[model samples]
Target: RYMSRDDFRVLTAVEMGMKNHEIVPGSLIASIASLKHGGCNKVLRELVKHKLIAWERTVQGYRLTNAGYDYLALKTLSSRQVVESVGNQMGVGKESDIYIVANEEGQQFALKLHRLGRTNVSWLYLSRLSAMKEFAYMKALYERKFPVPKPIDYNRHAVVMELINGYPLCQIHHVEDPASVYDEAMELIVKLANHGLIHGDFNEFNLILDESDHITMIDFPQMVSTSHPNAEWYFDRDVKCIKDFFMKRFSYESELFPTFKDIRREDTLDVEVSASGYTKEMQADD
Candidate 1:
């Protein structure tokens, strides 16, 4: 009851108008909202006060803010009975705001909200593509049992996935066998290569070691197909990402490491994801 039907309609109207607008004209919002300007401006002003939407004076335009988008997505998910309550925000990264949420059954799930265009200055990287890309890759990998988090659902720039309580490789101070863990971690890179993809930004920060020494890979928005022009460079860099991290943190060095020349195409998950319609496309609107 915190947000009235008018408020929800107004906010959602702004989003629908946002399809082609960087800053939506206020009149268009009112028209789409099924309300008069007198009532519409009051709703808009209330949304502004609540920090869900912003009114730009110069352009006389209204745009949904990060809080606005999050609210809209959360409301949809809530109605669908996907998420019931939100716990602490796990992390607010440059790319997304990650949250810990619980469903009506009291089961915890991870929620990520992609916050693209954090400002008006730079052509900030749009995040919907990133979200879709991540979801697609996570789907393919999970189906193949690649030791990844299971994806639950994705809406717009928000992604809901299985949450695993673990420490990043950077935080792990010791292991019974650093070498065993190191080899497995490095092997993941080669394995991903065999599956026809590369973890574009592999590093200790993206590798989580569970309490039982199980390694889980996360953060897949930047993955590239193994057939990319610079696949070798990316593959080599991924190997180094692991080797350097282990050497620094665990003081673990390996004389043996897989190279680009050491892997073969075991499958075509990259092609599978692309075929599933995750690849970017040309648009006429622009």
Candidate 2:
């Protein structure tokens, strides 16, 4: 019921302590008029009837309630933090806004801000849960000393991490050793599995080729815990994703390509070997 009404908007305006003109500028009214034209006036009336908004007794206008003002303030503060922290826009995907933020020492980082206004219940629920999982995966990968982005900070709705200063693997037109790249990516996938996690959205698009030609995973909002119901499916899909990309684009050998199911099988899930043939303990302090 709350989702269907203008209650959110009214509340937001009131919480911000906005006047009628500030809350519904002429531009806003035009937007609402367009919606009303499609038969949405019931949403507007609900806000008025609830006294979340009121007709200004003197000027025949509307104002928000105390509850509305508080909500709006919290939201505004969050948006302000993102804008102040990140210096420029990095990227925008369906689930988040990625910004290239710089730290005090002048190093660049990526801050992914997850939006709250989702239109669907299932998508919103899944997205929020997935964001949390992605944060955990990043932390685990960093702890394991995997060659991925370093996780710096994560709040409930946003993730802040170091930004790779290299081109995406997908955008690279040439490679001296495609096999090396492919092998390294596959190895990382296995490492991820060992940690009880899977990068559900893995692909060249999320693979960054650094100065040393190392691969770093990005766009982790879809990452999921291995305990999730769809974890196996995600693991298989990720393996297929990486395999198909390298084989088709880089002319890598088919023999090196592993099937989605093979990658997700119980036997291959955990290992202690690093790419350099060192045990996990051997690379512990490196």
Candidate 3:
């Protein structure tokens, strides 16, 4: 009955075919009430300690272990589960259409069902950029203890991650504590680089600010390894993207911008830039 975190992370939703969220408020206690009669919170706290599930303080809800559904199938009685889709459609992008699917319990999640069919190879290739990147990178980051959505399940066609509730930076172009977020985001990025990973697509659009203002980096299908030939390019581009979006749009101080840039470039990649903008000539020079 007990499984390692690694074991839990590899399981897929289709393998479990678990019931959809049908409960109200969908807290872990509410969703698992029938399964755990009286000690739902105890079981949940253990899972959280193990990093199997993530608790969203702002939403006051709990999401399943990114890999919870994957390992869950083994414990279930039946294998023939149905895919009756329901819930909110959160993200609609060129690669994947993300939906909010609930289990028979009231829990909510972001289900990224791939739109490309089995025979659509071109679509598969293009879609893999985001779909695969998000899945692989998130799993990798989880191993390093990064703050991210718990990836619940993924199939040959789709991947489901914890549905993080928060307004995008694009929506709240300003935060009461921009410096704190900048510092945290930079720390996250530096740690990722130190670990030999690069978020090829990092920006305001991909960052989520929860109720407490914690940063959740989404859309990782474009992430690259530091050793990747174009890794530096992506690293620079991603950092610049975040800086430009946050600074120009949010009006972050020009002085703080250079310091953040220097810390990221010198401590991590070791490069310097006055600001976070890159033109055609910059690319050509690099």
Clashes of each: 0, 7, 16
Off by over 4 Å in 3: 1-85, 115-119, 124-133, 254-286
Once model 2 is optimally superposed onto the true structure by TM-score, how far is the C-alpha of residue 111 displaced, in angstroms?
A: 1.2
lDDT by residue (117-198, candidate 2, tens digit) is 3332333334444445556656655666777677765543456677788888778878888878888888788767765557
Best by lDDT: 1
Worst 10 residues of 1 by lDDT: 277-286
lDDT for each residue of candidate 3 in 40-129, tens digit (9 for 90 to 100)? 455556666766555555235455443343234222311222223456666753355666766545566676644443332333333433
Q: What is the C-alpha RMSD of each candidate to the true structure, in Å?
A: 3.4, 12.8, 17.1
Candidate 2, superposed: residue stretches over 4 Å from native: 1-85, 120-131, 224-233, 259-286
Q: What is the lDDT of every predicted structure here?
A: 0.77, 0.57, 0.53
What is the C-alpha local distance difference test score of candidate 1?
0.77
